[PDB]
Protein backbone atom coordinates (compact mmCIF):
# COMPACT_ATOMS: atom_id res chain seq x y z
CA UNK A 1 0.00 0.00 0.00
CA UNK A 2 1.26 3.50 -0.69
CA UNK A 3 -0.37 5.08 2.34
CA UNK A 4 1.38 2.50 4.49
CA UNK A 5 4.63 3.48 2.83
CA UNK A 6 4.05 7.20 3.25
CA UNK A 7 3.40 6.46 6.91
CA UNK A 8 6.74 4.62 7.11
CA UNK A 9 8.67 7.33 5.31
CA UNK A 10 6.91 9.93 7.43
CA UNK A 11 7.73 8.22 10.71
CA UNK A 12 11.28 7.88 9.39
CA UNK A 13 11.66 11.64 8.87
CA UNK A 14 10.26 12.40 12.29
CA UNK A 15 12.64 9.96 14.01
CA UNK A 16 15.45 11.88 12.36
CA UNK A 17 14.08 15.24 13.43
CA UNK A 18 13.87 14.09 17.04
CA UNK A 19 17.51 13.08 16.73
CA UNK A 20 18.53 16.39 15.16
CA UNK A 21 16.69 18.08 18.00
CA UNK A 22 17.97 15.91 20.86
CA UNK A 23 21.52 16.29 19.61
CA UNK A 24 21.11 20.01 18.92
CA UNK A 25 19.71 20.54 22.41
CA UNK A 26 21.90 18.11 24.33
CA UNK A 27 25.19 19.15 22.71
CA UNK A 28 24.78 22.94 22.56
CA UNK A 29 23.08 24.00 25.78
CA UNK A 30 22.23 20.96 27.92
CA UNK A 31 18.97 22.89 27.81
CA UNK A 32 20.33 25.00 30.65
CA UNK A 33 28.28 27.84 21.61
CA UNK A 34 25.32 29.55 19.88
CA UNK A 35 23.65 32.65 21.44
CA UNK A 36 20.50 32.49 23.62
CA UNK A 37 18.00 34.20 21.34
CA UNK A 38 19.42 31.92 18.64
CA UNK A 39 19.16 28.54 20.35
CA UNK A 40 15.54 29.58 21.00
CA UNK A 41 14.62 30.23 17.35
CA UNK A 42 15.77 26.88 15.98
CA UNK A 43 14.43 24.95 18.97
CA UNK A 44 10.99 26.32 18.06
CA UNK A 45 11.28 25.74 14.32
CA UNK A 46 12.48 22.20 15.10
CA UNK A 47 9.66 21.52 17.53
CA UNK A 48 7.12 23.13 15.21
CA UNK A 49 7.82 20.60 12.46
CA UNK A 50 7.64 17.80 15.02
CA UNK A 51 4.15 18.96 15.93
CA UNK A 52 3.02 19.05 12.29
CA UNK A 53 4.66 15.70 11.55
CA UNK A 54 2.68 14.26 14.45
CA UNK A 55 -0.52 15.54 12.89
CA UNK A 56 0.42 14.27 9.47
CA UNK A 57 1.22 10.87 10.92
CA UNK A 58 -2.05 10.65 12.81
CA UNK A 59 -3.92 11.51 9.59
CA UNK A 60 -2.06 8.82 7.61
CA UNK A 61 -2.85 6.28 10.30
CA UNK A 62 -6.48 7.32 10.04
CA UNK A 63 -6.44 6.93 6.25
CA UNK A 64 -4.82 3.50 6.28
CA UNK A 65 -7.24 1.22 4.38
CA UNK A 66 -9.00 -1.41 6.45
CA UNK A 67 -7.59 0.28 9.55
CA UNK A 68 -10.69 -0.63 11.57
CA UNK A 69 -10.79 -4.13 10.12
CA UNK A 70 -9.40 -7.37 11.55
CA UNK A 71 -7.52 -10.15 9.81
CA UNK A 72 -10.34 -12.69 9.93
CA UNK A 73 -12.40 -10.26 7.86
CA UNK A 74 -9.66 -9.39 5.40
CA UNK A 75 -9.37 -13.09 4.64
CA UNK A 76 -13.12 -13.31 4.08
CA UNK A 77 -13.19 -10.33 1.76
CA UNK A 78 -10.40 -11.90 -0.26
CA UNK A 79 -12.27 -15.18 -0.65
CA UNK A 80 -15.44 -13.30 -1.47
CA UNK A 81 -13.61 -11.32 -4.13
CA UNK A 82 -12.01 -14.36 -5.71
CA UNK A 83 -15.43 -15.97 -6.01
CA UNK A 84 -16.92 -12.87 -7.60
CA UNK A 85 -13.96 -12.88 -9.97
CA UNK A 86 -14.69 -16.38 -11.22
CA UNK A 87 -18.28 -15.29 -11.81
CA UNK A 88 -17.62 -11.97 -13.49
CA UNK A 89 -15.30 -13.81 -15.82
CA UNK A 90 -17.94 -16.40 -16.65
CA UNK A 91 -20.19 -13.46 -17.47
CA UNK A 92 -17.46 -11.94 -19.57
CA UNK A 93 -16.91 -15.07 -21.68
CA UNK A 94 -20.66 -15.20 -22.34
CA UNK A 95 -20.79 -11.55 -23.33
CA UNK A 96 -17.91 -12.07 -25.72
CA UNK A 97 -19.28 -15.34 -27.10
CA UNK A 98 -22.48 -13.50 -28.06
CA UNK A 99 -20.81 -10.40 -29.43
CA UNK A 100 -18.62 -12.65 -31.60
CA UNK A 101 -21.64 -14.78 -32.59
CA UNK A 102 -23.37 -11.63 -33.81
CA UNK A 103 -20.35 -10.28 -35.63
CA UNK A 104 -20.11 -13.51 -37.60
CA UNK A 105 -23.78 -13.09 -38.51
CA UNK A 106 -23.15 -9.62 -39.95
CA UNK A 107 -19.95 -10.71 -41.69
CA UNK A 108 -22.08 -13.40 -43.31
CA UNK A 109 -24.68 -11.06 -44.76
CA UNK A 110 -21.95 -8.68 -45.97
CA UNK A 111 -19.75 -11.25 -47.70
CA UNK A 112 -23.06 -12.37 -49.19
CA UNK A 113 -22.94 -8.90 -50.77
CA UNK A 114 -26.06 -7.57 -49.04
Amino acid sequence: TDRMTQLQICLDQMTEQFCATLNYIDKNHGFEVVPPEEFSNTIDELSTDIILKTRQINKLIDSLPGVDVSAEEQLRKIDMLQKKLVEVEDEKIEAIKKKEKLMRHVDSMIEDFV
Binding site: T1, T21, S47, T54, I78, K92
Partner: protein, 95 residues
Protein backbone atom coordinates in the same frame (compact mmCIF):
# COMPACT_ATOMS: atom_id res chain seq x y z
CA UNK B 1 -4.66 -8.44 16.36
CA UNK B 2 -3.93 -5.53 14.03
CA UNK B 3 -6.54 -3.31 15.63
CA UNK B 4 -5.02 -3.34 19.10
CA UNK B 5 -1.76 -2.58 17.32
CA UNK B 6 -3.30 0.57 15.81
CA UNK B 7 -4.54 1.56 19.25
CA UNK B 8 -1.16 1.37 21.02
CA UNK B 9 0.34 3.03 17.99
CA UNK B 10 -1.93 5.99 18.72
CA UNK B 11 -1.18 6.07 22.46
CA UNK B 12 2.56 6.12 21.95
CA UNK B 13 2.33 9.03 19.55
CA UNK B 14 0.48 10.90 22.26
CA UNK B 15 2.96 10.23 25.07
CA UNK B 16 5.78 10.86 22.60
CA UNK B 17 4.59 14.40 21.93
CA UNK B 18 4.07 14.76 25.69
CA UNK B 19 7.64 13.82 26.61
CA UNK B 20 9.00 16.03 23.86
CA UNK B 21 6.97 19.07 24.86
CA UNK B 22 8.34 18.67 28.40
CA UNK B 23 11.94 18.12 27.28
CA UNK B 24 11.71 21.09 24.93
CA UNK B 25 10.49 23.31 27.76
CA UNK B 26 6.85 23.94 26.73
CA UNK B 27 5.58 21.93 29.70
CA UNK B 28 7.18 21.69 33.13
CA UNK B 29 9.67 19.03 34.14
CA UNK B 30 12.31 19.49 36.85
CA UNK B 31 15.98 19.23 35.64
CA UNK B 32 16.95 15.82 37.11
CA UNK B 33 14.30 14.35 34.81
CA UNK B 34 15.84 15.71 31.61
CA UNK B 35 17.35 12.24 31.31
CA UNK B 36 14.29 10.04 31.90
CA UNK B 37 12.69 12.15 29.19
CA UNK B 38 15.32 11.66 26.50
CA UNK B 39 15.40 7.97 27.30
CA UNK B 40 11.60 7.76 26.90
CA UNK B 41 11.66 9.68 23.66
CA UNK B 42 13.78 6.80 22.31
CA UNK B 43 11.98 3.80 23.75
CA UNK B 44 8.70 5.17 22.44
CA UNK B 45 10.13 5.77 18.96
CA UNK B 46 11.51 2.25 18.79
CA UNK B 47 8.17 0.87 19.99
CA UNK B 48 6.36 2.81 17.27
CA UNK B 49 8.62 1.50 14.51
CA UNK B 50 8.31 -2.09 15.77
CA UNK B 51 4.56 -1.67 16.02
CA UNK B 52 4.33 -0.13 12.57
CA UNK B 53 6.30 -3.02 11.02
CA UNK B 54 4.10 -5.68 12.59
CA UNK B 55 1.27 -3.92 10.75
CA UNK B 56 2.63 -4.55 7.23
CA UNK B 57 0.91 -7.92 6.67
CA UNK B 58 -2.43 -6.22 7.29
CA UNK B 59 -1.70 -3.45 4.80
CA UNK B 60 -0.53 -6.04 2.28
CA UNK B 61 -3.80 -7.97 2.35
CA UNK B 62 -5.38 -4.59 1.71
CA UNK B 63 -2.99 -4.18 -1.21
CA UNK B 64 -4.35 -7.46 -2.54
CA UNK B 65 -7.99 -6.58 -1.97
CA UNK B 66 -7.36 -3.43 -3.93
CA UNK B 67 -5.93 -5.43 -6.82
CA UNK B 68 -8.84 -7.87 -6.84
CA UNK B 69 -11.39 -5.09 -6.65
CA UNK B 70 -9.68 -3.12 -9.38
CA UNK B 71 -9.81 -6.22 -11.56
CA UNK B 72 -13.42 -6.95 -10.78
CA UNK B 73 -14.42 -3.42 -11.73
CA UNK B 74 -12.35 -3.49 -14.90
CA UNK B 75 -14.07 -6.70 -15.99
CA UNK B 76 -17.58 -5.48 -15.25
CA UNK B 77 -16.47 -2.55 -17.33
CA UNK B 78 -15.73 -4.67 -20.38
CA UNK B 79 -19.07 -6.41 -20.02
CA UNK B 80 -20.82 -3.03 -19.88
CA UNK B 81 -18.77 -1.81 -22.80
CA UNK B 82 -20.09 -4.71 -24.91
CA UNK B 83 -23.73 -4.31 -23.91
CA UNK B 84 -23.41 -0.69 -25.07
CA UNK B 85 -22.24 -1.73 -28.52
CA UNK B 86 -25.12 -4.16 -28.85
CA UNK B 87 -27.56 -1.33 -28.10
CA UNK B 88 -25.76 1.02 -30.49
CA UNK B 89 -26.04 -1.66 -33.17
CA UNK B 90 -29.70 -2.10 -32.28
CA UNK B 91 -30.15 1.62 -32.84
CA UNK B 92 -28.42 1.82 -36.23
CA UNK B 93 -30.66 -1.10 -37.12
CA UNK B 94 -33.97 0.04 -35.64
CA UNK B 95 -33.98 3.85 -35.49
Amino acid sequence: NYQYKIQELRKLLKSLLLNYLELIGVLSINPDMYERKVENIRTILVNIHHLLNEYRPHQSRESLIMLLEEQLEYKRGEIREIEQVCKQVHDKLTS
